[PDB]
Amino acid sequence: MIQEQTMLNVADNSGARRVMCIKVLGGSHRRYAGVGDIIKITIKEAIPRGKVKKGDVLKAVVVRTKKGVRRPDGSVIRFDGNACVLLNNNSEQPIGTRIFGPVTRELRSEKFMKIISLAPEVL
Amino acid sequence: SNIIKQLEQEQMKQDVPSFRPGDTVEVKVWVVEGSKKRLQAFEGVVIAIRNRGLHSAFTVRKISNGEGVERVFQTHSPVVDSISVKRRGAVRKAKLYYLRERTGKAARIKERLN
Amino acid sequence: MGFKCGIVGLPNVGKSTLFNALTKAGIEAANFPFCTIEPNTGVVPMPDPRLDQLAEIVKPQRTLPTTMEFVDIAGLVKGASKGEGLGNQFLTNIRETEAIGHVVRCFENDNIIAVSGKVNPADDIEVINTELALADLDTCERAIHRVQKKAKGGDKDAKAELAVLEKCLPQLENAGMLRALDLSAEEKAAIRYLSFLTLKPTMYIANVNEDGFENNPYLDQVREIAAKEGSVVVPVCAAVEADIAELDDEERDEFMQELGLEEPGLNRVIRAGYKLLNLQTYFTAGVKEVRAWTIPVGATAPQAAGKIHTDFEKGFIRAQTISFEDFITYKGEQGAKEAGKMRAEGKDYIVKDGDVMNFLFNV
Amino acid sequence: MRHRKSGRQLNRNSSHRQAMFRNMAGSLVRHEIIKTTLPKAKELRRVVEPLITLAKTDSVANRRLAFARTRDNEIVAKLFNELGPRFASRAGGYTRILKCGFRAGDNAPMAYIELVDRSE
RNA sequence: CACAGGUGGUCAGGUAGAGAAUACCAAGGCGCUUGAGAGAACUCGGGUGAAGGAACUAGGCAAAAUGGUGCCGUAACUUCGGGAGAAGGCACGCUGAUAUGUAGGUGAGGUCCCUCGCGGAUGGAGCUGAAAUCAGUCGAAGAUACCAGCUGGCUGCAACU
RNA sequence: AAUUCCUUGUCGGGUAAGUUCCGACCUGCACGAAUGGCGUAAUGAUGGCCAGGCUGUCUCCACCCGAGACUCAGUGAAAUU
RNA sequence: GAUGUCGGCUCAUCACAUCCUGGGGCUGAAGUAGGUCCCAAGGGUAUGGCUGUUCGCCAUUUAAAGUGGUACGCGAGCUGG
RNA sequence: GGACCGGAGUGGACGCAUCACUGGUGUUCGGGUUGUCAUGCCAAUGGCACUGCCCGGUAGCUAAAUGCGGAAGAGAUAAGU
Ligand SMILES: [Mg+2]
Ligand SMILES: [Mg+2]
Ligand SMILES: [Mg+2]
Ligand SMILES: [Mg+2]
Ligand SMILES: [Mg+2]
Ligand SMILES: [Mg+2]
Ligand SMILES: [Mg+2]
Ligand SMILES: [Mg+2]
Ligand SMILES: [Mg+2]
Ligand SMILES: [Mg+2]
Ligand SMILES: [Mg+2]
Ligand SMILES: [Mg+2]
Ligand SMILES: [Mg+2]
Ligand SMILES: [Mg+2]
Ligand SMILES: [Mg+2]
Ligand SMILES: [Mg+2]
Ligand SMILES: [Mg+2]
Ligand SMILES: [Mg+2]
Ligand SMILES: [Mg+2]
Ligand SMILES: [Mg+2]
Ligand SMILES: [Mg+2]
Ligand SMILES: [Mg+2]
Ligand SMILES: [Mg+2]
Ligand SMILES: [Mg+2]
Ligand SMILES: [Mg+2]
């Protein structure tokens, strides 16, 4: 349940530490992004020497939320903290080369095979 | 109600082990990767149990790869293949939500030998 | 002092043969002082073709490549972390070095027996890492116990160490491999002194058959693992490496051209170890000698001066830096100099890969 | 909405309601019949009758619960030494509401609530 | 107006507390001169709130928050006082031991003197009594309630009160 | 600029985005030296701006507790017309 | 002998000179994407930074961010910049 | 670079319902706890301190929860053919 102004920890090694959601993409008046949803972000905190820079505007895919995901059986998977993986604006592809922390099955689709393959643990 | 009792009972899993909040449990869940079912183990502390017959649930909390992860399992869902208690913890409280604030040393709980 | 990648695994993984093919191709101690080669310390020549190129261009009387040491760590038993002697020998063996190469078998052989009966590298890696993580959790518990008393004394450094350790402890209690954690450079610095076995950069040497360099479900499993923790791989054959180290240049080229290999796989292995430890190579070029030396990426000019002589480090004045490609294009030190492609670098400089310089000191 | 909810607010905050019904339960126990308002009597059923049920078994713990609920040791004594035995075989329904009309001062609907065996 | 306002002085119990604060009580005094129900919207006065966290708005208005003591620590700048409680960090309950109640306060007998008194020494019985350390112990939480600073940066104006 | 019309001046900072803010510039419509100029620590229920924390301020409201509103009994208005 | 103002909020409602979606003619319409005109009002038709602003610039969305009337709709509904 | 036509999925916004799930609430349930008063005292309890402060939480209500919807068709047409 990521919305505009929601700060996300970053789950890759792109060099961003804290990003902010500035748009929930994919719909007029769309309110929230869950996991597997692309958002537009501004990088609010970056490591000094990283592939991305503070104040950069780009995309991210939400991979962990505190709401979490429901599963078809009715079960839910909540995470501590909201995290996203940075993506290129045009290619939609991840910018880092490492994924840190678990991701979910909801992220498993043609578009995010890289994040699934790189993740330590897919839930 | 009696009708719904029957429908829910006809469906309730029969092998659910005894476990209490604070117990470290390992839950085997079925993962359907494409076509094939494997078992994925989720091992963590039971921080909450909902006792509702067929709608019984329990929350398991563990730190995966640096981040706390809670899975609320539906006890009788057939996706939960098995539950096994690995460590009986000693908490005197039904819901261990205070563990969400605990880190490391203060998040572990006394082993229950009772 | 050098750079080390200890060769580890379960029993019967193909490590002794790997270290043997290493030492057969390596250089004995009669060609490099300061290096008393132990039977578990095998120093081998580092492959830098830029060294051959510079030695062609300048034609020195002698040639010295940089040489890097392997430490073959053998002997592991289930329950190696419960205090037993051979497991503790394993621990003390691996702890001294800094880079770690795990050996995986990714081949099916009726005349070689596996570790659990079914040939599956996932099982191999999980058992080895559960061992290393039990040892590591032991270490981290001791450290966190040693620290929290100090951090309750209000010390800031102790609190930062405490935060890192308590964010690392649930990783180790779950048999997880602590390099998968997103630990910052400051945190890496904070806990470098605990010398954890589970963050040391680890490569994956994949002993595979001759006909299976591609399309290998065991190699595929190793690939997915090495991605899942950001590790690298060198799929090789121990038999092919023994053939490589046991022949002359003519027969080595013959066996390479028959099997389609262009350089020995040991070159690729030691190059994986080279890039594993943030290493890079510079050269000294001259008529007397051309020698390769190796520095960490990020290294200073003063430490590069020191890596030969201490006085060079301490009395440094200026270094005259020319790249390997700049040596290449203009045919020698004089040729690249006459273009002005020396650069004057002081005590704030960082030496890169390929640069050749002539140090100036006054002590 | 108040779908399925129980318990009359009776235009009091909760602790006033609890105090009032404690007092009213004590009044009913010691006098065995009291005039109050019909809604108040209907709610008083839900407090008194469990006290009598509790008093059907005379342990120290049960006298302690009764005392917590009544805060009157004379009421607890009469509950366990008289009322419990007087209702030992009666399966609930220890009170009787008898509507008795309308209070003059505010036209309030009034009832008598008594112990069922108040005749004997 | 039998009006939620205003009106000087005197008294000043207990437990906790620094306290005339505050909480709960005493003596004392009251339940405020319409009640009874119900448990819609809406309003007013509160409580809680998933995920988010100023996106609200003219404006963080309101709310939420901070909040005690001790110790450590404390920047720019300064008129050298300040700034400053800057900021920030740690500890905190209970029980036992030290010590059948300590440091300290009080000080009765008894002993000696005495310009025999409401004296001075000595002496410590009794009473009172922190603070600290160590060890143990309960809880999710020990300044547990009430009470009780939000903090920092840039800047206009006016020295200030 | 408590002063600047043009004007959201220009450039820079800060923000993803800054008519406000801060710094500089100076093309001062229309500053200027006791109807003082310029600085200035401290101070302020003073004006403006930024950040941390904090949050139902908001997304986007939900529930609950009480006082009314509602029903009954008693009493008994008002503006307006 | 009083018809309360701008903007915001809340709630709208109509028109159609249509922003999107629907149908079509022409095209300097290969396709994709457009331009233009005709039909068409069923439904839909941003969030933010700045500023009291509407507006506008800007950031980032959207199929689209339509244009007007309604006392420049709406203060016995709110606000009061 | 790249389609019409036709087909399948899956979303956004919106709407209706519902509470099985996931949750909020839950001053009517249980517990913990500080101060204090009281129940003769101990023990145990109760009152008050915002429900004293909190931790959970049943039913209900409920959204963020999860079901369903917009249609297809058929007449008569618009522009047009
Ligand atoms: Mg009433
Ligand atoms: Mg009166
Ligand atoms: Mg008065
Ligand atoms: Mg007072
Ligand atoms: Mg909330
Ligand atoms: Mg929350
Ligand atoms: Mg705003
Ligand atoms: Mg706004
Ligand atoms: Mg305020
Ligand atoms: Mg100004
Ligand atoms: Mg003044
Ligand atoms: Mg200025
Ligand atoms: Mg702002
Ligand atoms: Mg600007
Ligand atoms: Mg003037
Ligand atoms: Mg003059
Ligand atoms: Mg003058
Ligand atoms: Mg003043
Ligand atoms: Mg009325
Ligand atoms: Mg009436
Ligand atoms: Mg038209
Ligand atoms: Mg108007
Ligand atoms: Mg208005
Ligand atoms: Mg009006
Ligand atoms: Mg005004």
Q: How would you summarize this macromolecular structure in one to three sentences?
A:
Chain A is mostly beta strands. Chain A contains one helix and seven strands; from the N terminus they run E-E-E-E-E-E-E-H. Chain A is globular and about 45 Å long.
The separation of the N and C termini of chain D measures: 44 Å
Question: Per DSSP, what share of the residues of chain B sits in E-state strands of 2 or more residues?
Answer: over 45%
Ligands in the model, by name, code or SMILES, are: magnesium ion
Largest interface: A-B, 21 and 20 residues
Q: How many strands, which pairing sense, and closed or not: the largest β-sheet of chain B?
A: 5 strands, antiparallel
Order of helices and strands of chain B: HEEEEEEE
Residues in β-strands, percent of chain D: 15-25%
How many individual helices of chain D? 4
The assigned CATH architecture of chain D is Alpha-Beta Complex
Name of the CATH first level of chain D: Alpha Beta
Task: Provide the succession of SSEs of chain D.
Answer: HEHHHEE
CATH topology (fold) name of chain D: 50s Ribosomal Protein L17, Chain: A
- By secondary-structure content and strand pairing, the structural class of chain B works out as mainly beta
Protein name (chain B): Large ribosomal subunit protein bL19
GO cellular component, one term (chain B): cytoplasm
Subunit structure (chain B): Part of the 50S ribosomal subunit. Contacts L14. Forms two bridges to the 30S subunit in the 70S ribosome, contacting the 16S rRNA. In pre-50S ribosomal subunits interacts with RsfS, which may inhibit association with the 30S subunit.
GO molecular function, one term (chain B): large ribosomal subunit rRNA binding
